[PDB]
């Protein structure tokens, strides 16, 4: 009613001011990045919590404070070898500059002769991926709780000219309160106008990526649709054993919904999962507000989500600091640090 229009009116003005403030903060750090704020011998490495192409994330303990952190370690030589210097520089530069409730928190970064290191707040709830596969699927209220955090995070990143490009349950950490922290900024980029790199996870790729088109931040809104679908269904909308078969499904303009999906969910998803850019929610003239005002989100108090005052429909359990029961077990590997500096010029800004 009239109260709702007034409420919406003042909250939008308040988001615009928040965003302009957040862009000034970000730009200061983006243009003059922090470097070399810690060292390796100050941390006991406890457990590998995840791996990737050039390294791994470990639970570590900062010996001087006793605090637990998650430390990402990347092998400089592997990076150069696979020609991915720019992407790894992007990741660190962005992470050191952003600040938002649903992003991982970079506390320290440094490098030595062999590796790059990023020390971030430890999120003990594990990856959404693990709970999603175990449980099978999330209820619509559970999925919506998470989707709402993504919507605000993307509104925030996009207003900073950042494109994220790798949304998926694997890349969403759960904190102690059951809230999300987006990780894996390896494919994120600050861009004005179009970009062309073929990157992302097959199931989540927007059709304009697959079609070698040139693309923009609308790919993130498409990905949100895939994410919402997978959370609510237990499987993604487009899958197959060979990536080419996934891509053909993505570009066909066809999606089928489980019979248990609400009408409202199906409608949100048909609009997010639009092959036509000029028709995709998130990318029209009202932008993100078409998503925020869709009926599926009717129960969502956007400001209360931001302030983390909403009760999480699900919370992983944990027993004290440094517990890792919410993580899978990986093979461990001792960290050898070379006597000779490797790839020094390439990573000099890091």
């Amino acid at each position: 009613g009239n109260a709702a229009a007034a409420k919406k009116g003042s909250e939008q003005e308040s988001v615009k001011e928040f965003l302009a403030k957040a862009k000034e903060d970000f730009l200061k750090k983006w243009e003059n990045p922090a470097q070399n704020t810690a060292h390796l011998d100050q941390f006991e490495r406890i457990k590998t919590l995840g791996t990737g192409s050039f390294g791994r994330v470990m639970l570590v303990k900062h010996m001087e404070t006793g605090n637990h952190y998650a430390m990402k370690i990347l092998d400089k030589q592997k990076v150069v070898k696979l020609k991915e210097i720019e992407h790894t520089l992007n990741e660190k530069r962005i992470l050191q500059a952003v600040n938002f409730p649903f992003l991982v928190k970079l506390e320290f970064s440094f490098k030595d002769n062999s590796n790059l290191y990023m020390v971030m707040e430890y999120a003990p709830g594990g990856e959404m991926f693990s709970h999603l596969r175990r449980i099978g699927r999330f209820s619509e209220p559970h999925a919506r709780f998470y989707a709402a955090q993504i919507v605000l995070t993307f509104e925030y990143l996009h207003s900073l000219d950042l494109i994220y490009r790798d949304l998926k349950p694997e890349n969403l950490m759960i904190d102690q309160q059951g809230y999300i922290q987006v990780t894996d900024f390896g494919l994120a980029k600050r861009v004005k106008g179009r970009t062309w790199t073929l990157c992302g996870t097959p199931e989540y790729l927007a059709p304009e990526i697959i079609l070698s088109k040139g693309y923009n931040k609308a790919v993130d809104w498409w990905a949100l649709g895939v994410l919402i679908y997978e959370m609510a269904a237990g499987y993604p909308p487009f899958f197959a054993d060979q990536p080419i078969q996934i891509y053909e499904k993505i570009v066909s303009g066809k999606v089928r919904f489980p019979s248990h999906f609400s009408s409202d969910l199906k409608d949100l998803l048909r609009n997010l999962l639009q092959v036509d850019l000029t028709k995709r929610f998130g990318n029209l003239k009202n932008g993100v507000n078409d998503i925020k005002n869709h009926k599926w989100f009717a129960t969502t108090d956007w400001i209360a989500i931001y302030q983390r005052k909403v009760e999480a429909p699900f919370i992983p359990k944990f027993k004290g600091p440094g517990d890792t029961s919410n993580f899978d077990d990986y093979e461990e590997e001792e960290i050898r640090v070379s006597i000779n500096e490797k790839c020094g010029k390439e990573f000099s800004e890091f």
């Binding site: 694997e170 992302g200 996870t201 097959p202 269904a233 993604p236 054993d241 489980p258």
Partner: peptide, 20 residues
């Protein structure tokens, strides 16, 4: 069912990104 087809697929583990 689609769920059975997913679970029987090679795509239920952690998915890698492409970058090439």
């Amino acid at each position: 069912t689609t769920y059975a087809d997913f679970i029987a697929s090679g795509r239920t583990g952690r998915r890698n990104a492409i970058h090439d």
